[model samples]
Target: AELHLESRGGSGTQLRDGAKVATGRIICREAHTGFHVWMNERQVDGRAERYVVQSKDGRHELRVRTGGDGWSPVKGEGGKGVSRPGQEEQVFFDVMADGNQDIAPGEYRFSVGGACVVPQEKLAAALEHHHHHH
Candidate 1:
């Protein structure tokens, strides 16, 4: 399994409203029956962390929330099925930080796992500006 991040409208990974919004896909180069994809989040400094399991299909999504303890899944379900070689599974993650503040500025690692086949991604921080009203 391999993870690939994509740039949307020239913006790759972004920080919005204290949440990390990014899109990517998991590639399976080898055929496997009953495969699964797991997503793990870790700070660049290697502090707080969390992980969740997802399905191999592109029909569902899992949203995560950050807390002191760790990140937790707030929505979605796991997928089950067989994966063919060169299969691509879509993934969109919008992870929100605790206290409604921008997540720590730095590189964050996003990893996908299926037992042995694991791929990691490093997300660069790009803040979005919000218009303030008086």
Candidate 2:
């Protein structure tokens, strides 16, 4: 699967679904006051799953049904997108599913489509901001 992450009108981040691979959406909303890491799942067969990790008072909360497509992934060898960082195979998925949303900053990759929804400077700022917090 392909994953694309970008900003929408300087207000918030926008993550567009690609295919089967699960990618990471690193977001800092409210003027960098809080964070929300949305991990979109790999598409199985013809569908995928979604969720949101919202930051509150320096803590993280896992919210189910936060955002996702009803279908599962294609279940091939794997999809082509951002892979999980420094964790087990099912760690991120399992934890988020169980209502755990604690995460540190790190490198996240994404693929693009159509026009660039986010400005180059804004994307750079967001990347730098999240670069050190992990």
Candidate 3:
């Protein structure tokens, strides 16, 4: 499996509070019966957080967040099998930062069935404050 992450809507990878920053996809060269997909985030404090979602029955929901709340399901299509050699199976996902706390930027990685699919990439997150004039 191979992972690819791309910024969405002309926005960069920097994530703002309650905003979706990127779209991610996992490309599999061949089909598998079922497996667990892992999304890992290496925080600035040297702590790594892992989010696991099951991929079976040709579907998966990738839940991710940057705040204290539990993982929120991203909005996108799920995975499907190619069923033929040289064909590809892809899982698409789009994630946003939960507005519960100050966003903590980190390096993100992904894997499928315990195999590393996407290498670590820095994703910056922060809370955007707006000023009001009275």
Candidate 4:
């Protein structure tokens, strides 16, 4: 309903598709330390059983969950810190469209969250690499 922080940035293809849409409930991991947001869901312990999204597009939204609480914002500019009850830290991660996806034929620039964590850079590289192949 309400948006604490919403950054809609796009990337063209880069050197590698290790792209990942990375913005944060907290941009700097050093800033936010409640928990990690995984796959549009809230997870208390990162070790929590979870599945990764195989296929992802550029335009997408990332949601966060408070430990036991529900969903809310954590540490943005003016975010509500764990408004949800029974929850530890509300969280949300980034979802980026890899630019490197378009890397050379048979040459995958990077894995989802492998080499390129930055979505914009990764995607841009991928697109460029893909085109260079031709």
TM-score of 4: 0.24
Reference-based lDDT, residue 51, model 4:
22
Candidate 1 C-alpha lDDT tens digits along 1-134? 55555432213333344344444444455443222333453222222323332334433333333321222332333321112222233323333432233223333444444321334569989889898998
lDDT assessment of candidate 3:
0.38
C-alpha lDDT values of all predictions: 0.35, 0.28, 0.38, 0.31
* Clashing residue pairs found in predicted model 3: none
- Those runs of model 4 whose alpha carbons end farther than 4 Å from true positions after fitting are 1-5, 14-20, 26-33, 41-99, 103-134
lDDT of 1 at 14: 38
Tell me how far the alpha carbon of residue 11 in candidate 2 is from the true structure, in angstroms, after superposition: 14
Candidate 2, residue 71: the lDDT equals 19
- TM-score, structure 2 vs. true: 0.19
User: Where does candidate 1 stray beyond 4 Å?
Assistant: 7-20, 40-100, 115-134
TM-score against truth, every candidate: 0.31, 0.19, 0.35, 0.24
TM-score of 1: 0.31
93: Cα error in model 3, Å: 1.3
lDDT of 4 by residue, 1-134 (tens): 11233343333444243234344452222223234333333232342322232225433322222222243444544332232222223344444432333322221111211111122323434353435555
Of the candidates shown, which would achieve the greatest lDDT relative to the real structure?
Answer: 3
Candidate 2 lDDT over 21-104, as tens digits, reads 232333222222212222343332332223333443434433222123221222345332222322111112111232333243
Every candidate's CA RMSD:
22.9, 20.3, 23.0, 23.4
Please tell me which predicted candidate would have the highest TM-score against the true structure.
3
